[PDB]
Amino acid sequence: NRKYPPLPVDKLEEEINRRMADDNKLFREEFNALPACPIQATCEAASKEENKEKNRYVNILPYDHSRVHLTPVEGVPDSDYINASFINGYQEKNKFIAAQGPKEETVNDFWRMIWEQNTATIVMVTNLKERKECKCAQYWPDQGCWTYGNIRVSVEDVTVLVDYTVRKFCIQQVGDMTNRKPQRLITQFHFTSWPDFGVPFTPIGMLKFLKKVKACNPQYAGAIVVHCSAGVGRTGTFVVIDAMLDMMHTERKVDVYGFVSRIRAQRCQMVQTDMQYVFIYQALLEHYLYGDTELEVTSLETHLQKIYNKIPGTSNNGLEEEFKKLTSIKIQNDKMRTGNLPANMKKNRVLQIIPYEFNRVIIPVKRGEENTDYVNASFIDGYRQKDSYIASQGPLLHTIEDFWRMIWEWKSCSIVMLTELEERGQEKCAQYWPSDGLVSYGDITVELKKEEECESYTVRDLLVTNTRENKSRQIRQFHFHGWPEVGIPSDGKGMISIIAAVQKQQQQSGNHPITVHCSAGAGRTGTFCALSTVLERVKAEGILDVFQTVKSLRLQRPHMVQTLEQYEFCYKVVQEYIDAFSDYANF
Numbered sequence: 340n341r342k343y344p345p346l347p348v349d350k351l352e353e354e355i356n357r358r359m360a361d362d363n364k365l366f367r368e369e370f371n372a373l374p375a376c377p378i379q380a381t382c383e384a385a386s387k388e389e390n391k392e393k394n395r396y397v398n399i400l401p402y403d404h405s406r407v408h409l410t411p412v413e414g415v416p417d418s419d420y421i422n423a424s425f426i427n428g429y430q431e432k433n434k435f436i437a438a439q440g441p442k443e444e445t446v447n448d449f450w451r452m453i454w455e456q457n458t459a460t461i462v463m464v465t466n467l468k469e470r471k472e473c474k475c476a477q478y479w480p481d482q483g484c485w486t487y488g489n490i491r492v493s494v495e496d497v498t499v500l501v502d503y504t505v506r507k508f509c510i511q512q513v514g515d516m517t518n519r520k521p522q523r524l525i526t527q528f529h530f531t532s533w534p535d536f537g538v539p540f541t542p543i544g545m546l547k548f549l550k551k552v553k554a555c556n557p558q559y560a561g562a563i564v565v566h567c568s569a570g571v572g573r574t575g576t577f578v579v580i581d582a583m584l585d586m587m588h589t590e591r592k593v594d595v596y597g598f599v600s601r602i603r604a605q606r607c608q609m610v611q612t613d614m615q616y617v618f619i620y621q622a623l624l625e626h627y628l629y630g631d632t633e634l635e636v637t638s639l640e641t642h643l644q645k646i647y648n649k650i651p652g653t654s655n656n657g658l659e660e661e662f663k664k665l666t667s668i669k670i671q672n673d674k675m676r677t678g679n680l681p682a683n684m685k686k687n688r689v690l691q692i693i694p695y696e697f698n699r700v701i702i703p704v705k706r707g708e709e710n711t712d713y714v715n716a717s718f719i720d721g722y723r724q725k726d727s728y729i730a731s732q733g734p735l736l737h738t739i740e741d742f743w744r745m746i747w748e749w750k751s752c753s754i755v756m757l758t759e760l761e762e763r764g765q766e767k768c769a770q771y772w773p774s775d776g777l778v779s780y781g782d783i784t785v786e787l788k789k790e791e792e793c794e795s796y797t798v799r800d801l802l803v804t805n806t807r808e809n810k811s812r813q814i815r816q817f818h819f820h821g822w823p824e825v826g827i828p829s830d831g832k833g834m835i836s837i838i839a840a841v842q843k844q845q846q847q848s849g850n851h852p853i854t855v856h857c858s859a860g861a862g863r864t865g866t867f868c869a870l871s872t873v874l875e876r877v878k879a880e881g882i883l884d885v886f887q888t889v890k891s892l893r894l895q896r897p898h899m900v901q902t903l904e905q906y907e908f909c910y911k912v913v914q915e916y917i918d919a920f921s922d923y924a925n926f
Contacts, residue, residue, distance in 0.1 A: 343596035389417040405605040424606035429585035438566040440475030447488035457561030464573035474568040502532040502544030542622035572611030632886040636926040682710035689859040717896035722875040732860035733768030743783035752848035757863035767858035782807040795821035795833025831912030865899030881925035
């Protein structure tokens with residue numbers, strides 16, 4: 340096709356911008372211009388009456404020339420069929436299997452394919468359910484061992500992170516004492532962060548996911564099995580990103596149109612929607628613009644020398660270079676509608692800092708009052724859990740009741756306050772806790788039980804009672820006093836201590852969303868969220884990605900880490916934490 344030729348990388352950003360314009364106008368044309376199939380193909384086996392219960396959809400059928408054949412089972416007619424196809428990589432034939440997520444009745448067939456194909460790696464790009472609709476049968480055990488036909492599957496390990504879960508299994512074909520085959524270590528990469536509507540708010544999760552898959556797949560293994568529900572949409576997105584990253588590295592070009600066309604010779608509808616197609620381009624651009632910003636702790640000193648000094652041939656340091664990339668990202672004005680409604684405008688401290696719709700913190704509608712579901716607060720992904728933080732403005736006098744309804748609704752047991760009530764003679768936050776005894780805000784009563792005074796913060800033990808529900812909760816407020824009226828704290832000691840105190844409270848109260856606020860709920864709030872995530876990850880892995888941590892916050896709530904000095908403070912605290920606990924093994 341001469342209308343969608345390969346794109347050199349230096350025109351990738353410009354072309355994405357043009358193709359994204361007028362509501363993805365030229366991207367939709369491009370996607371709609373994909374061939375259904377560039378070759379003459381048949382689906383005789385897939386269409387056989389005897390195989391009908393083995394397919395999720397009558398119109399998603401593997402082609403005869405590219406289908407994955409199961410070995411015939413003696414006495415079982417039609418036992419050679421599974422809904423799965425071989426798929427080429429950039430330069431490698433049949434690198435992948437694109438498979439349907441098994442149905443209950445094809446779980447055994449799915450495992451037999453994995454065994455027969457010598458597969459080491461399974462890539463799952465669907466949740467089991469979307470809105471109580473089953474997308475995929477759970478084909479793995481949660482603990483111990485289960486036998487699926489003649490394939491014994493034993494749980495080895497499970498690692499849960501915010502964007503994906505990695506599960507290790509020991510598998511073995513059993514049932515023949517005269518032919519005991521050796522066990523195989525299988526790794527399942529489960530992408531859990533694709534939302535039910537739209538695409539991930541950032542492509543970095545998908546790029547990190549792909550990196551781990553590639554690093555883990557061993558020599559001698561057969562095709563990597565990639566599946567979603569139908570095995571064409573998100574499955575196609577994964578395979579095409581992998582191939583196009585290779586093309587970018589080898590040719591300094593991408594050809595998404597050409598590559599998607601090519602793999603459609605092997606399986607119908609690979610990349611099933613315009614939004615999946617656009618997300619491929621977004622992931623390639625993410626890689627091209629930012630590359631790998633993860634640092635092993637032993638690389639941090641070298642990185643900080645770069646960050647804090649002038650970039651040669653420029654008038655900026657590395658900190659300014661990184662910060663300019665963060666501020667160059669677009670605030671999505673069409674996603675900030677609810678906070679901008681006339682009835683909600685007075686509930687916001689700062690017009691430009693209001694939630695995006697996709698992660699806005701929704702509260703119960705009070706009685707029969709419209710626009711009463713709104714608070715200026717956003718759910719933020721952490722290191723291990725989705726919605727780890729509520730990034731909230733500090734309440735106004737007239738939003739304290741809404742603030743408490745939010746805390747109660749979302750089960751927060753940790754409140755982090757990163758402002759004084761007044762700074763530089765300006766009101767920054769309304770007092771929402773009692774200085775002594777009891778205070779009431781609608782259905783929520785708040786009693787002060789204990790105070791402790793730490794070096795940089797006060798801890799207030801609050802007994803919080805919903806008087807409608809007749810239920811009480813112990814909620815701890817961490818009131819940070821270490822933030823100066825101008826600039827940033829002189830050191831990270833206070834920030835490190837308050838993050839540790841919150842982590843302690845979370846561990847013993849059930850790891851509910853942490854309510855984090857300053858005044859407008861972006862600058863200091865963003866710094867606390869960024870550092871809670873970075874310190875948890877550095878402790879777990881000895882890796883830090885300050886740049887992508889802050890970038891993801893900017894994509895979840897406007898101005899998270901609002902200023903250059905706040906961004907500087909993120910690096911200063913991480914450096915101090917590592918230097919303080921330098922003998923910690925993972926570093």
